[PDB]
């Protein structure tokens, strides 16, 4: 992949993945964008030179680094008025931070709007020289990586607020839609006897994919950037922007066989080839698949996830055993989403700059009544409980500069407080199961995060949060560059249209 350091030129262009043409905003020439990739430890710096021309997608853009806790670095988060302004066309604007104790699975994206869904999205991943799970595959690089895109024929900002389902799954950019069933598919090449760590990310701005290979079983080693205990697995559901490591062996007859990624909504099934991609052990005829799905009897459950190495749950084996708790009460008047009784909506000056130019509380930072003061060096302990109020559901919740802990699992009523997974994006259920998804985490990176659901076109009508965390040790602990601090000047004088 493009190593440590490089250029990500950001452009508009026609393109058809699913074969349908149509414009949008591209990274170095394609849509889903190249895959980024490091070693643990190593500098980033990802020069993001921003050429767009066309307003309707929007020529302003800013990029988030999903997974990555930019600890120190809050100013590179990417988050459009929260943690920078948007970067102005014509202009570029450098991303350099470093990445530590960190390796797995990530994905970077346009943190600008709902523009990530109409093309700047790209998977990122980050190698551990000496990973754990070495011994357990053979292959692992480029090709090993699986990326689900819900591709959109219409733009994001032209089409319906809520879309309602996509024209055409993407894996590994390419897929068909109902319409054009003759489009050609991904090809992902194994060869007879050989392990391969695939690397399974959600570019996804709304849809949740049911992931399956026929004839295959997949080893779970990674979930959101943590290394996982193995675990054997039939199928997986994966929200946006969720990432998931498993091995498979190509241990089945020489043959192709079928890679289902079945949305939850929109173009359902697989009548055409759509929603598919193609497994191809070496030797076998470059034609489509004609194996069968069979039932999974091993599906994915979240609360069967485990992390590799012991790792204690932040507060006490206790409902609300923790420094701060806090509950999100999820709301919806039909435009807008809510949270406590708020519906997000940018501030002219972003939040990061908010504070460093004085904001000393909740209170001043703005927008009010979606900001909250978190102490520093503390346990938090936050609840999502499923609401009818709020359509959409399962809603994707994703907290930025923080691995969580999940206590509490969708459709699930135990509260594991001893062997929970840590991640960063999980879904809140849904209703009828009774769900409270609760999740926890330490204070452990100074400076304001977003929190709000994955969902692009949710996070676009309100649907977020903020968290100022440890406001005081914000501006020194997170140094900004002179680039950084002319983004906005240089953003304000722009005129609406002129972009
Ligand atoms: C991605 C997208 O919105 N495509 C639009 C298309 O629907 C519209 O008809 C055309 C105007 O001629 O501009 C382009
Ligand atoms: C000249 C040009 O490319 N303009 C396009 C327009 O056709 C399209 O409707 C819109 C959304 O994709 O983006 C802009
Ligand atoms: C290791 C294991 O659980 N065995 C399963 C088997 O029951 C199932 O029929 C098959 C489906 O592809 O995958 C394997
Ligand atoms: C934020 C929190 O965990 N505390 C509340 C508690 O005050 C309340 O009595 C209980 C039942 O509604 O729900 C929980
Ligand atoms: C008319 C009405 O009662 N609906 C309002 C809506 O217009 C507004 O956008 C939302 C958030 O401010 O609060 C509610
Ligand atoms: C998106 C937004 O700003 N919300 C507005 C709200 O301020 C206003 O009060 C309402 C009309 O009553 O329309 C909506
Ligand atoms: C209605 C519901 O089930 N949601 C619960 C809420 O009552 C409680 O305050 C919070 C703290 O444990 O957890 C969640
Ligand atoms: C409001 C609303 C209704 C239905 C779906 C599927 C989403 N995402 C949002
Ligand atoms: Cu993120
Ligand atoms: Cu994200
Ligand atoms: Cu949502
Ligand atoms: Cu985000």
Not at 160 to 188: E, H, Q, Y
Not at 213 to 233: C, F, K, Q, R, Y
Not at 334 to 351: D, H, R
Not at 460 to 481: H, L, M, Q, T, Y
Request: net charge negative; with cysteine; glycine share 8%.
């Amino acid at each position: 992949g493009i190593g440590p350091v490089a250029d990500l030129t950001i452009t508009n262009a026609a393109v058809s993945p699913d074969g349908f043409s149509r414009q949008a905003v591209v990274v170095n020439g394609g849509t889903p964008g190249p895959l980024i990739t490091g070693n643990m430890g190593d500098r980033f710096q990802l020069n993001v030179i921003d050429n767009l021309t066309n307003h309707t997608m929007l020529k302003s853009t800013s990029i988030h680094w999903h997974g990555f806790f930019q600890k120190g670095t809050n100013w590179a988060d990417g988050p459009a008025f929260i943690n920078q302004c948007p970067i102005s066309s014509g202009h570029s604007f450098l991303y350099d931070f470093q990445v530590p104790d960190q390796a797995g699975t990530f994905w970077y994206h346009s943190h600008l709007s709902t523009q990530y869904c109409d093309g700047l999205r790209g998977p990122f991943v980050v190698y551990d020289p000496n990973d754990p799970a070495a011994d357990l595959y053979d292959v692992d690089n480029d090709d090993t990586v699986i990326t689900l895109v819900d591709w959109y024929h219409v733009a994001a900002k032209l089409g319906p607020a809520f879309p309602l389902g996509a024209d055409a799954t993407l894996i590994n950019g390419k897929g068909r839609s109902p319409s054009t069933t003759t489009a050609d598919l991904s090809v992902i090449s194994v060869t007879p006897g050989k392990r391969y760590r695939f690397r399974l990310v959600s570019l996804s701005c709304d849809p949740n994919y049911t992931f399956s290979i026929d004839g295959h079983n997949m080893t779970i080693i990674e979930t959101d950037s943590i290394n996982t205990a193995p675990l054997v697995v039939d199928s997986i559901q994966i929200f946006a922007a969720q990432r998931y490591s498993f091995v498979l062996e190509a241990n089945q007859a020489v043959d192709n066989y079928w890679i289902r990624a079945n949305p939850n909504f929109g173009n359902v099934g697989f009548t055409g080839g759509i929603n598919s991609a193609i497994l191809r052990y070496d030797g076998a005829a470059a034609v489509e698949p004609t194996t069968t799905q069979t039932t999974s009897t091993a599906p994915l459950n979240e609360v069967n996830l485990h992390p590799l190495v012991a790792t204690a749950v932040p507060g006490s084996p206790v409902a609300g055993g923790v420094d701060l708790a806090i509950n999100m009460a999820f709301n919806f008047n039909g435009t807008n989403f809510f949270i406590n009784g708020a519906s997000f909506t940018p501030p002219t000056v972003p939040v990061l700059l908010q504070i460093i130019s004085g904001a000393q509380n909740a209170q001043d930072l703005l927008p009010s009544g979606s900001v909250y003061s978190l102490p520093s060096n503390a346990d938090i302990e936050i609840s999502f409980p499923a609401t009818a109020a709020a359509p959409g559901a399962p809603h994707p919740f994703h907290l930025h500069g923080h691995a969580f802990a999940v206590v509490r699992s969708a459709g699930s009523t135990v509260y594991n407080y001893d062997n929970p997974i840590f991640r960063d994006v999980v879904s809140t259920g849904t209703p009828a199961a009774g769900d409270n998804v609760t999740i926890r985490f330490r204070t452990d990176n100074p400076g304001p995060w977003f929190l709000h659901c994955h969902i692009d076109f949710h996070l676009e009508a309100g649907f977020a949060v903020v968290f100022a965390e440890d406001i005081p040790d914000v501006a020194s602990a997170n140094p900004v560059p002179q680039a950084w601090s002319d983004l906005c000047p240089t953003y304000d004088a722009r005129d609406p249209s002129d972009q």
